[PDB]
């Protein structure tokens, strides 16, 4: 690789390394409950053994219909450890959207919990259902499994809707690269306390989760109640001394910097209209303006707002992150000089395999990269231009 990362390693192997190195550090917190790395790894290994007995193997698509909880994290790690891919089903979605996704994914096994079991019955799922908080796993072996795995294996499938819902197929490789990117560029260490803002069916939530779990850091799962009340959100971050959070700009605009002291890095996805937000926070923490679709593992470019500088008027999306490439091209995929507007196309290790059972759309969006023969590049449909200082400005849709 151009920039070193843990090549040849799967997501669960990177987690197992952290669990070995920091067994007693806190791994996940949800309300009054918490698990250390060792307790989390042990529980995930027991469930992984049960999943293996049910047929979970390479590229098996395991549906997950669970609350934003510690059990959902155990389920994710267990699916990965068994060698399968997890497909989170957003339990807030209307019944018909869940039914469409279940049918499209063709999943033969759904992992759920007691409080979500009636929803699984109501969506009429006829495959195998494992109710995790009804499964007797406490007697199973707790050691790591060591199932065969390659970084090109499917790790997860994220569904999103814009026509019909489509599943983006993400492999282990991009998340392994993001582990090194977060450690290098965000300074992530085991001392960090990371808030999980997004619900676990969103690709950005999977990314936030592994930003903590692949570095020995703690992940604080923020409840719906904490998020719904701005004062409660500020108090939760302050009480628990959270150091990293990724938020949407529309949520960040309601927060008071004085009420949050502990944050060392804040990541958000905005453009020029977020200049007042950047100017307000850039001097209080490391402000990161990030850009990256699900199709490239939720990361593509970053711009850290220079702190010791006068107010900015424009907010770029920055430069490509390690082992990724950005191209600004015209309709014929020809490169454009500075100042010329074109389509943002992304290459490199974060690229999705494609869209689940959508071969024509996959071929249309993940095209041959003419600049790096033998590789693909993703056509974002986003308009952008290079600035002469070498940063990219986001301009909307093509
Ligand atoms: Cl191993």
């Amino acid at each position: 690789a151009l920039v070193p990362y843990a090549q040849g390693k799967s997501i669960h192997q990177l987690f197992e390394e952290q669990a070995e190195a920091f067994p007693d550090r806190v791994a996940i917190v949800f309300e009054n409950r918490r698990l250390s790395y060792q307790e989390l790894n042990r529980k995930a290994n027991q469930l992984a053994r049960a999943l293996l007995e049910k047929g979970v193997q390479t590229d098996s698509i395991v549906g997950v219909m669970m609350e934003k909880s510690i059990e959902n994290v155990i389920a994710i790690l267990a699916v990965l450890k068994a060698g399968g891919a997890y497909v989170p089903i957003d339990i807030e979605y209307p019944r018909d959207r869940i039914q469409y996704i279940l049918q499209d994914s063709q999943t033969k096994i759904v992992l759920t919990q007691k409080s979500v079991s009636q929803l699984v019955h109501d969506v009429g799922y006829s495959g195998e259902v494992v109710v995790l908080d009804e499964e007797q796993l406490d007697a199973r072996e707790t050691a790591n499994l060591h199932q065969p795995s390659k970084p090109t294996d499917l790790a997860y499938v994220i569904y999103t809707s814009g026509g019909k819902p489509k599943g983006t197929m993400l492999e282990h490789k991009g998340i392994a690269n993001l582990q090194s990117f977060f450690q290098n560029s965000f300074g992530v260490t085991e001392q960090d306390r990371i808030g999980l803002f997004a619900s676990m069916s969103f690709a950005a939530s999977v990314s936030e989760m592994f930003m903590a779990l692949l570095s020995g850091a703690s992940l604080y799962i923020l409840s719906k109640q904490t998020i719904h009340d701005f004062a409660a959100f500020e108090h939760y971050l302050s009480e628990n001394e959270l150091t990293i959070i990724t938020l949407p700009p529309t949520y960040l605009t309601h927060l008071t910097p004085e009420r949050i002291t502990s944050l060392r890095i804040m990541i958000t996805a905005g453009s020029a209209s977020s200049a007042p937000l950047v100017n307000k926070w850039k001097d209080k923490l490391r402000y990161i303006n990030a850009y990256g679709p699900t199709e490239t593992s939720c990361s593509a470019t970053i711009w850290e707002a220079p702190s010791n500088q006068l107010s900015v008027q424009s907010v770029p999306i920055g430069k490509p992150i390690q082992n990724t490439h950005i191209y600004i091209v015209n309709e014929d995929l020809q490169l454009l000089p500075t100042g010329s507007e074109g389509e943002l196309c992304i290459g490199g290790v974060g690229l999705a395999r494609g869209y689940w059972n959508r071969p024509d759309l996959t071929a249309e969006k993940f095209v041959d990269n003419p600049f790096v023969p033998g590789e693909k590049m993703y056509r974002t449909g986003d308009l952008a231009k290079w600035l002469t200082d070498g940063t990219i400005e986001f301009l909307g849709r093509i």
Side-chain angles (χ1 to χ4, degrees):
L2 200 72
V3 177
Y5 75 103
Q7 293 188 261
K9 301 291 170 197
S10 70
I11 295 166
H12 50 287
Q13 282 173 317
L14 295 180
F15 170 71
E16 288 157 9
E17 171 164 87
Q18 298 305 156
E20 183 172 356
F22 305 113
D24 300 325
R25 290 201 63 83
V26 175
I28 48 176
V29 177
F30 183 70
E31 291 184 335
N32 55 346
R33 312 168 52 193
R34 55 183 66 194
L35 286 182
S36 68
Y37 269 81
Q38 183 169 255
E39 297 170 324
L40 176 58
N41 192 48
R42 284 193 185 160
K43 286 183 165 302
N45 281 331
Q46 290 177 311
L47 180 56
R49 285 189 168 84
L51 293 180
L52 222 53
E53 289 189 342
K54 298 159 185 292
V56 175
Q57 63 187 28
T58 303
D59 289 9
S60 278
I61 268 180
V62 183
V64 174
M65 287 181 66
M66 300 185 85
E67 266 132 20
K68 203 185 168 180
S69 65
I70 281 171
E71 287 63 47
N72 194 336
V73 185
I74 296 172
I76 292 166
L77 289 175
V79 166
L80 295 173
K81 285 160 171 288
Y86 84 99
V87 186
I89 287 125
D90 193 329
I91 68 172
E92 305 305 326
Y93 275 174
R95 195 196 295 191
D96 63 291
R97 192 176 297 156
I98 296 171
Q99 289 169 330
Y100 185 87
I101 293 172
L102 281 176
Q103 169 139 15
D104 186 74
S105 69
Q106 296 166 343
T107 184
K108 298 180 171 201
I109 181 159
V110 166
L111 313 178
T112 193
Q113 60 187 100
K114 289 185 213 276
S115 63
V116 184
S117 161
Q118 185 57 47
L119 175 66
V120 179
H121 280 271
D122 286 336
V123 307
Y125 183 61
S126 68
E128 188 165 15
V129 180
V130 185
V131 185
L132 301 187
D133 50 356
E134 282 180 11
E135 204 83 344
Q136 178 48 57
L137 302 171
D138 290 336
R140 300 185 172 273
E141 183 91 352
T142 60
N144 289 330
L145 282 71
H146 310 287
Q147 288 305 116
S149 180
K150 310 175 198 313
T152 55
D153 287 347
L154 216 46
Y156 58 103
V157 178
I158 300 299
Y159 276 81
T160 200
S161 35
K164 304 257 213 295
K166 58 179 176 302
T168 298
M169 301 187 283
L170 283 324
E171 296 178 356
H172 286 77
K173 184 149 127 173
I175 296 83
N177 179 57
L178 292 175
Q179 176 208 45
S180 286
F181 166 65
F182 296 146
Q183 288 175 7
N184 277 306
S185 297
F186 297 167
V188 175
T189 77
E190 83 283 359
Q191 301 294 328
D192 282 303
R193 304 186 174 191
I194 306 188
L196 187 66
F197 185 81
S199 305
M200 314 189 76
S201 70
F202 291 87
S205 180
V206 183
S207 201
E208 299 180 81
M209 182 181 62
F210 289 122
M211 180 188 300
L213 300 181
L214 311 181
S215 287
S218 53
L219 183 71
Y220 285 73
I221 306 177
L222 303 180
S223 73
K224 182 161 71 166
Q225 301 72 44
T226 295
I227 290 163
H228 178 263
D229 186 331
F230 302 125
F233 181 86
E234 293 170 338
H235 182 256
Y236 191 92
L237 264 58
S238 294
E239 197 94 289
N240 293 291
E241 307 176 10
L242 305 198
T243 63
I244 308 178
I245 194 112
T246 297
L247 293 178
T250 50
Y251 194 89
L252 178 68
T253 185
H254 299 107
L255 306 179
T256 318
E258 295 70 33
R259 296 293 175 278
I260 314 167
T261 28
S262 54
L263 293 173
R264 68 161 188 96
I265 188 161
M266 189 286 183
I267 307 126
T268 195
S271 67
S273 69
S274 65
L277 223 42
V278 173
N279 290 326
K280 178 180 200 191
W281 296 87
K282 72 186 200 181
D283 58 311
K284 286 140 181 291
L285 38 68
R286 301 178 58 195
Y287 189 101
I288 310 300
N289 192 51
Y291 166 85
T294 300
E295 291 93 343
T296 69
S297 308
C298 304
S299 282
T301 72
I302 66 160
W303 178 69
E304 176 165 351
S307 55
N308 61 323
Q309 294 305 310
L310 291 172
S311 298
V312 302
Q313 61 286 281
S314 305
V315 179
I317 58 168
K319 300 180 188 185
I321 74 158
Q322 62 171 72
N323 302 315
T324 82
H325 302 296
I326 284 284
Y327 310 102
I328 296 174
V329 298
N330 68 6
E331 61 288 342
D332 292 310
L333 309 170
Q334 296 161 331
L335 294 167
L336 299 180
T338 297
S340 291
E341 301 170 8
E343 180 177 29
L344 260 174
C345 296
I346 306 165
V349 302
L351 257 63
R353 186 188 282 193
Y355 302 120
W356 176 257
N357 281 15
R358 297 292 303 278
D360 284 351
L361 180 68
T362 294
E364 179 184 333
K365 303 296 174 195
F366 298 85
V367 307
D368 289 330
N369 180 342
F371 317 110
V372 189
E375 288 190 13
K376 299 284 181 183
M377 66 174 188
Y378 173 66
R379 296 186 62 176
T380 68
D382 295 325
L383 192 63
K385 71 181 181 184
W386 286 104
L387 300 177
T388 198
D389 67 6
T391 63
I392 296 153
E393 177 168 322
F394 178 88
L395 300 160
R397 301 288 291 174
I398 70 165

